[PDB]
Design a protein around this nucleic acid. Structure first.
Ligand SMILES: Nc1ncnc2c1ncn2[C@@H]1O[C@H](COP(=O)(O)OP(=O)(O)OP(=O)(O)O)[C@@H](O)[C@H]1O
Ligand SMILES: [Mg+2]
Length: 246
DNA sequence: ATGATCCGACGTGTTAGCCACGCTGACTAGTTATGCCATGCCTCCCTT
DNA sequence: AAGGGAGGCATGGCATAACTAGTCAGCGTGGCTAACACGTCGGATCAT
């Protein structure tokens, strides 16, 4: 009969339930527990494992290079940013408010770290997330359009609840393809937040995309509902380099 | 990589209204039938 | 039984005359379209 239970558990797509079947049976036998409560505990454990696996699969699907969180961010080394605003962001009220989040400042000041932390927080609470660099997004959209499947990739870039655009400005975008980026900003406008990190000021966006009018339209759509952080201070990579040297 | 599930879009059915196609009649033009003559092919008969 | 020869009938070509098909116009009837609602099928995504 035990083999039948194991086979049924595997067929019903409950691997972990079967794995811990003997342990839970022994626990129930040793200590008297109501059947309802025992099933509640078993289903709760299965749901916890399923949630962990789903979070890991979402992390894999969302191309996050390195996993980080707010807990690892040192506000003392970066006093230019108020921790209160970051904590307010972590509440994910902007998702309901459709507000974007723009990080600006010199390289290595934690912009990417903060963006990844916000993305991880969104993923944990069950919100679909996606991470990509601006150059990669533009190139992927261009390649999809050249294949006559731009709409599919546009859906891919629009479907995520939280889209992260990292390093917008380090590499100049091809003028013939900048519009692709605008499309995303045009379709995610008032629909889903965008977390964009850059080292260039807004006035220079025209240089990045090579079209002043398109850059102005993109900025107007992006900044309509957004929270802008102007981070300052010394580079964290250089700080670590000095600490290692010293 | 395959199967199962869920979601979204398209097709269908129904009803009503409008537009296009079919039928009919008349007139004109082009094609077919027929007669006649000539030639070729098919059939029948006879011989081996 | 097969081959060759002879005879008869059928076909083709040409010319003329008559009948039928095509075209156009008008009117009537049937089919297509549109709108809306509902159900089914296809596609995409996630889990094994
Ligand atoms: N305050 C901080 N606390 C902890 N780690 C930090 C902090 N600031 C930066 N780092 C780490 O330093 C490295 C570079 O920082 P990060 O990429 O977040 O900065 P950035 O401004 O987005 O960089 P860049 O523009 O050069 O790409 C990463 O490992 C990041 O985790
Ligand atoms: Mg960075």
């Amino acid at each position: 009969m035990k083999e039948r239970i194991h086979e049924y558990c595997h067929r019903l797509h409950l691997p972990v339930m079967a794995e811990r079947w003997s342990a839970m049976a022994e626990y129930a036998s040793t200590h008297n527990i109501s059947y309802s409560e025992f099933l509640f505990r078993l289903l709760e454990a299965e749901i916890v494992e399923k949630q962990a696996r789903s979070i890991q699969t979402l992390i894999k699907l969302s191309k996050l290079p390195y996993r980080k969180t707010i807990d690892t961010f040192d506000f003392t080394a970066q006093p230019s940013v108020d921790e209160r605003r970051i904590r307010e962001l972590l509440t994910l009220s902007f998702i309901d408010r459709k507000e974007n989040i723009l990080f600006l400042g010199p390289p290595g000041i934690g912009k990417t770290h903060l963006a990844i932390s916000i993305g991880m927080e969104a993923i944990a609470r069950g919100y679909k997330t996606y991470f990509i660099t601006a150059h990669d997004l533009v190139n992927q959209l261009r390649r999809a359009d050249q294949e006559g499947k731009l709409e599919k990739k546009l859906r891919v870039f629009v479907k995520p609840t939280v889209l992260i655009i990292d390093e917008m400005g380090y590499l100049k975008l091809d003028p013939n393809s900048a519009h692709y980026l605008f499309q995303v900003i045009a379709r995610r406008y008032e629909h889903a937040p965008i977390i964009l990190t850059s080292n260039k000021s807004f006035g220079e966006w025209g240089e990045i995309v090579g079209d002043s009018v398109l850059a102005t339209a993109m900025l107007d759509r992006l900044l309509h509902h957004s929270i802008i952080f102007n981070l300052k201070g010394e580079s964290y990579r250089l700080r670590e380099k000095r600490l290692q040297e010293e």
